Amino acid sequence: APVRSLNCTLRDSQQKSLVMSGPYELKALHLQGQDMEQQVVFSMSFVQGEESNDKIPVALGLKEKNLYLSCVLKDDKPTLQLESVDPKNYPKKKMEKRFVFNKIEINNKLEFESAQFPNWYISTSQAENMPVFLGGTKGGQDITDFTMQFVS
Numbered sequence: 001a002p003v004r005s006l007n008c009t010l011r012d013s014q015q016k017s018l019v020m021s022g023p024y025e026l027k028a029l030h031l032q033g034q035d036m037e038q039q040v041v042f043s044m045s046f047v048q049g050e051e052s053n054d055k056i057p058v059a060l061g062l063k064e065k066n067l068y069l070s071c072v073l074k075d076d077k078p079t080l081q082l083e084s085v086d087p088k089n090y091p092k093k094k095m096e097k098r099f100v101f102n103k104i105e106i107n108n109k110l111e112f113e114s115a116q117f118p119n120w121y122i123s124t125s126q127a128e129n130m131p132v133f134l135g136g137t138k139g140g141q142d143i144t145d146f147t148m149q150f151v152s
């Protein structure tokens, strides 16, 4: 059948929102009131992959954009990028592995682990207005826990 998707927003555990800045540039900042319109709305697709009660493979596309978060080696490191796709072909149930995150529910928060790069997570910095990145530990000063808000 089709792939199933939900619209949503994400905020890090310090309650920073994710907003688009430069071309293909996703950053996190503290946001409230009128400025909340600037936050990125995701289309979270439920995709093919290894699954358990608390570990659900997803893709994260930008709502009504042919852009997906992906995990690739860049200058020899697991990095987070926004990648363009053919809008006729996406989303799909069998997303390529670089697009797949394991959405993990622990203690009423979510972590998004790269399916391609085990133990690398969507991360934010404590500082305002810094890139969203792929970080190689769910431990230390960088933030790897999020909450989801469901959108119409």
Ligand SMILES: Cc1cc(C(=O)NC[C@@H]2CCCO2)ns1
Pocket: 021, 022, 024, 025, 026, 027, 069, 080, 081, 082, 129, 130, 131, 132, 133
């Ligand atoms: C100036 C700025 C640059 C970035 C930036 O490079 N963000 C990278 C993330 C990875 C996925 C897409 O965005 N944010 S503010």
